[PDB]
Fold:
Amino acid sequence: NFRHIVRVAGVDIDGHKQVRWALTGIKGIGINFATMVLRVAGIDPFMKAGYLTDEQVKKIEEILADPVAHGIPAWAVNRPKDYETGKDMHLITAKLVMAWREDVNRLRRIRAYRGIRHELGLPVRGQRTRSNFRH
Amino acid sequence: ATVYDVPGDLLVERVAKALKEVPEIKPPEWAPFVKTGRHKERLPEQEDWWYYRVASVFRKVYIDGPVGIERLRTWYGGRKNRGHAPEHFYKAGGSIIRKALQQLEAAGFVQKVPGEGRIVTPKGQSFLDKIATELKKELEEQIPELKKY
Amino acid sequence: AKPLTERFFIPKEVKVMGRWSVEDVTVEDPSLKPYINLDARILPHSHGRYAKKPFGKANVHIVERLINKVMRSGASHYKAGGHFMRREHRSIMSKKMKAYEVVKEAFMIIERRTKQNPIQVLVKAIENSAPREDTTTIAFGGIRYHMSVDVSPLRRLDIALKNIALGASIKCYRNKTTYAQALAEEIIAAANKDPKSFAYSKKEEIERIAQSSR
Amino acid sequence: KADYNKRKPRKFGKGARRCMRCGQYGPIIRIHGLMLCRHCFREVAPKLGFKKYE
Amino acid sequence: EFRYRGYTLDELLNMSLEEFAKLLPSRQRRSLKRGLSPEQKKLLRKIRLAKKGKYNKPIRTHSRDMIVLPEMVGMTIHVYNGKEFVPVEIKEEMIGHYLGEFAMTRKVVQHGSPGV
Amino acid sequence: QKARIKLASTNIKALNEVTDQIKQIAERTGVRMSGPIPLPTKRIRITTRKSPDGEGSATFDRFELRVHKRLVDIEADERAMRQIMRIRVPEDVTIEIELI
Amino acid sequence: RVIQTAGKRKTAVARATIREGKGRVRINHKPVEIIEPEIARFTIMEPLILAGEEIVSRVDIDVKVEGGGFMGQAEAARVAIARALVEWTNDMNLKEKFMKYDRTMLVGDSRRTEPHKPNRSTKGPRAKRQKSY
RNA sequence: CCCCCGGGCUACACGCGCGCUACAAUGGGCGGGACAAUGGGAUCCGACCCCGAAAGGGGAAGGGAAUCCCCUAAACCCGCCCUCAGUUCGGAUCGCGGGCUGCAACUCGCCCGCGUGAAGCUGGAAUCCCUAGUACCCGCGUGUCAUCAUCGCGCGGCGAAUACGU
Ligand SMILES: [Zn+2]
Structure:
């Protein structure tokens, strides 16, 4: 009843560790969101990973597919108010990078300050660069 | 035989274990996914933290009442990690405290004074005193120096 | 998970921490008796008194001196064990409670393993770790030397206590071992005269160098 | 037609506090209704009644 | 195709400001709630008279703290940078951005040789 | 009905002057008076820098203005009011009266 | 009858009240046998352990302390309790034992903080920024 | 000369000074239990109640301050998880969203939430401050202030080691 390597969506997580921390190997899930998801599913977040049933994995995958329908307020998700749909969503390993890339690319396209700074590889928000930020 | 005659941690434990029968005291919808103040980083690890918080608020109203919801915020606040900036003190959130106090009032353990916070009733005073009596009866065997009190 | 009989402890007789006696403790070194204070007390805590008077440190209990030596941060401007040890915010500095607890647990472990008096063991460790001969620069005619000089007992005590505490800190730096276990190991080894003790090693080294350049 | 020489009525900022004696702008002690500069206060303090008393 | 929060431009053009602020990201919303100044009102008058008939001249302004609205899409505005008026052709993806985000005030630095 | 009188000043001699005047005023007649009661002294502190420039080590002047405070209750009788209100107060003392 | 006594430490003030009873000692309404931490509990209880049961089993002491940190409060309470016991017993053997053990039980401590000075005023009077050009 | 409107002093291959955060167990996190002082306060401090997950929003007693407020400080104690690992160490950088001040937050402001998770494994030559409630460690007040403190000036909490010399 122990799986040394469990296969959650896309990612292989450790078994010897607790679930709330094993789920952090995925890109887009922190400890807090993992605790939220496990509490919504009805799983002990202190249980050793690998003691996970196919039913449990499936429920976790469905919640990740769409958490807001299973609870998960719209203020605890990485991408509230999507640019082209609204429809508060939570992106993971594959779509998160594409979202970052398309945001930066539309900035570069409209030729805005932040996009020019991204191109040049320089600080973007407000920093001073005389004494620090040296490679 | 009173609250002042036993430690606070053991008493909060034994009161959280007992506040579960009271049906007017239950966690709200947004409880399982929330932090206790900005000065924290991670959520509570215990799955029954609501009752512990309610018991602590109950005992605090007993001790220091009349007290409203801005000094309990100070008591429950703490020290935040601000990254590369130095550490500072910040207060906690008020919704937890409001809900706890309203539940306690609904159960009939506290009441509000017109202009000075809230106080415990005799019904609640009896609760604390009896739980403390049981705890002291259990303790005064481990430490016989408590019998004379 | 400390039991209550140890969390809420109440002493009856006047002993060190209410647990360990001194009237059976002996001292063989005829040079260290007048400076190893073994007066019966409960709290080995003096609130900074006895420091302004030149020879006031002899009125301080030896256990309090060990606590104050342990309440350190490590090696800051010199190297010990081959490294700097600068903690600077994870340090027990100006925190006597944690030192109290470290020494308490160390004495418990010592009592357990040896089944003797830990204060007796500490006294033996001091006597076996105190150096008798050192070096210094002395000038005559206008040139510089390196001579061999004796040492005073009030300084031997400081050397021994400092070395014990430093050995504990070394053994505890970045390792699963704890500060209390390290202190206990150091004290037992120094009492039993084993080369694996930092303090005994330093004593032997100093005495050798002095006998050499005398 | 004759109004392009007058300032604006500032309510906040360093341009809202001149010194009653000299006319400096930046450093104003501003404690207890003192609109004086740190240079003139140090010279007129005894006339106002302040002493050292250390 | 272009869609801002699931709305096309034809739809955005017939919504009220009280409805478009609900879509903006809270800073332009705060700005519009507090209100517009006379400078921005005059610029709006210019824009509206230009998009139909009367005004056939370049639209120049010193207003860099003005937010891009839907009824400006399709025009070209000249924004002051401190030295001159930079042209900016307003597109759809600009909606919700300040007008000064497209008129830089400095120059890209090309370093030389450190001296003595 | 009683009357309270508060005295504030920078000079202690003027305070003692007025207080002993009213004390005799109240002892000649037989009337109950409490005090004078001393209240905490209030200090206006101002620390500032000496140099008018930035060069040189930094040095600071610390100026202080002290204010001493006394309280008195007089029992508010007609004769007392009459023969109290007629006392020339030294200009370096502020005095305020009011009935409870 | 009743007796009241006082004790002082750095910014801490304690006042104790003693009478006849069974041997109850209370600091701020709570017993002394469960005071935390141990290093303050012992500080407070040293005088009672010195006097003995044959004196403490006939008295009830209540202490009210205010200001100046927990160790300072404990020391002030210790001083006040010692003074109250001595004044209640009117015995010289106890006073001599106290003076031998620690003369600061009855006598007080006369140490306050030194004002800070303007180089690094935040840190202390004798502490300043470095010079490592 | 002096008054408005926009920019800049905030631009960054680099050399240096003074600092903050760290490289973990002499600890990180969660939940409970304690304990200060100095100072300040009129369109100012604002208890108390109700909204909101948080930042914050709406009413509003009292106070011209020994009367009311800022103000139940942190380090510390108890229990549970982690056990020597670029980690439940560390936080840089960046995306989306929600807010407050202000006539105006792009250049160029502060706060909150969910994600992301860069160097850094105790540091060469050399150099600095400290003799008692002093140094190390911990956090609060005030000045600057519409909004903004890794700063200056001060306040307390815990609290040493060595030498009484040349
Ligand atoms: Zn001037």
Notes: The pocket of zinc ion is lined by residues D 19, 21-22, 24, 37, 39-40 (CB under 6 Å). Strands of chain C lie at 133-136, 139-140, 143-144, 147-150.
